[PDB]
Amino acid sequence: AFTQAPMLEQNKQLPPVDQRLPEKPLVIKPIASNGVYGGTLRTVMRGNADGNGILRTIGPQGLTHWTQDIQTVEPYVAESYTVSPDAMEYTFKLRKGMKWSDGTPFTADDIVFAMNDVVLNKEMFPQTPSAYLVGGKAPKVSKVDDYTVKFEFPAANLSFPETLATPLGQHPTLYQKKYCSQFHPAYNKNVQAEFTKANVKDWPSLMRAKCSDIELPSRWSSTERPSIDPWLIKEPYGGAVTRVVMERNPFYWQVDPTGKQLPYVDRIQYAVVSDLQAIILAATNGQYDIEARLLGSDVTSRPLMLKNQQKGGYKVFGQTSANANAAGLWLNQTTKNEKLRKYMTQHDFRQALSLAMDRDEINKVAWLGQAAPWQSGPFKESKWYNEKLATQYLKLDLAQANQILDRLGLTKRDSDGYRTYPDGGRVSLDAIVMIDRQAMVQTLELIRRQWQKAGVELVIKGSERSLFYNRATANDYDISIDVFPGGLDATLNPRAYVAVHPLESRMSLEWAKWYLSGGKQGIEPNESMKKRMALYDQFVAAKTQSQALSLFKQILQISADEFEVIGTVRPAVISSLHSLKLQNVNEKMPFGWPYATPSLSLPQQWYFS
């Protein structure tokens, strides 16, 4: 029934293609055209700790997969799934006859092993990955038959199919029972014997070294770890290698609509390059068939990328980042500065700071005019769009900023012209920033000059990553600048709207610590934030789509009313490229880690014309 790549037909030692495929392979409809076999995809990683560059090239092979427009998911590794009307139980049907890369059967036993003996095993994971929890509670995972697996959660868990389409939700398909059980004491009663050979103290360390985890280097550094990936490691991603090579999985489990077993492309070759400038040089000379991850953020490179398209033989395409803001101001409402805190906690003070900002200037200078003014809210293309959350207080209005600050009682000036607190002291805010993030540093320098005209002093505290994070978790900052997620991914990454992320909800990480500790640690949030946290717990456990929509829209509305975080610009278009010869790249796909882009575009159906 099916056909195969010439390089596999060249291999007389493989089983027949019909026996390498499942009985019912997943049929992949191409982005643009039915493809032809062959070729080597040339791409690039920066340094030797860039393993997600492989994952975002080949794609997580999860139980479900995002649609191209990322509005929902469809069965992927699973042939089909069902959900109970209370949304607590998900049952997945697997593809009979599907095989791992080593030709052995892929069955419910593998999913149940991955969940019950790895993911939910507390020696392996003392903290269970949140992808498999609802309100912090784990499901019961059970084998129904050789090709059916059931997940039973203790509360409704409507987001689970979406979670299973993200890179962090792929554990269910990551662990082959046969191979991995060798390193597990419930199966290998002599496993302690493997420890010294592998230089490990315990079996979780052995399991991580041999069988790995979503983002561990060990995922890509061995050639013997079985997978269901479209290409397989052949020259591995060691810590000092200069190139990685992957080759088609002869047991890949998908066909195109003509019955060709995928992928079309035979091999992927990754250059490992230490200097981002050398990557830009190579890319703008056409040496990569795809680069849609590393170059797109450096707006300084777009002019040369565009100019050299004809010379290099490539096409630039623009992608919309999922992030709502490229460099947003997180205002710390639990700042230890008691005089400042009296104003930081006032909505109108935060409003005044936003009105004193000139986002057109920030865009022109920091982003070469390629971004656009924006606050924190989802984009119009998102079902979560809230006009107020997106666009309030965006236009420069220095007169109104000063009117508000006068009304708040900050009229007395010091000898330098700055406003002072009633009790004395310059109105001054410390902003922490990671020094190597140049556009963010430049953004803060611009805001510093702009806020001077409102009589407010911004003190830039740039540092390397460790001190930047240590300052945040120590509650030692007034402002922190970093991205606002939520343009497209608001429910996946809600950190700007409700203080649930322990490192990044920097309207107050002490508030987040209170939320995550059941109120025993951290600092009790204000009523509007406690209300959102309660709504968020209700949302995660919502029993119907309509209830979930209502609850999360309410969170976004309260966030808009409170105006806790101040956006500068939504990201410029992400400049990506592919060779003109490379077909079936979805140039309309969004950009983002939750969709593992560019692999969202189904690289197994890219092909060379």
Numbering used by the authors: 2 to 610
Task: Copy the relevant paper text.
The space group of this crystal was C2221. One molecule was included in the asymmetric unit of the crystal. Residues 1 and 611–619 were unable to be assigned because of the poor electron density map. SPH1118 consisted of 21 α-helices and 5 β-sheets built from 15 β-strands. The C terminus of the C terminal domain (residues 573–610, Fig. 2a cyan) in SPH1118 formed a small additional domain and was located in the direction of the N terminal domain. SPH1118 is the first example of SBP in cluster C that binds to polysaccharide such as pectin. The surface electrostatic potentials of SPH1118 calculated at pH 7.0 showed that the cleft between the two domains was positively charged. Interestingly, SPH1118 showed three conformations [SPH1118 (open form), SPH1118 (full open form), and SPH1118 (closed form)] even in the substrate-free state. The crystallization conditions of SPH1118 (open form), SPH1118 (full open form), and SPH1118 (closed form) contained the substrates (ΔtriGalUA or sodium PG). However, no substrates were bound to SPH1118 in these structures. Compared to the C terminal domain of SPH1118 (full open form), those of SPH1118 (open form) and SPH1118 (closed form) were closed by 18.9° and 34.2°, respectively, suggesting that the domain of SPH1118 was flexibly opened and closed even in the substrate-free state. The crystal structures of SPH1118 (full open form) and SPH1118 (closed form) were obtained only under crystallization conditions in the presence of sodium PG. Conversely, the crystal structure of SPH1118 (open form) was obtained under several different conditions other than those shown in Supplementary Table 2, indicating that SPH1118 (open form) was likely to have a more stable conformation than any other substrate-free conformation.
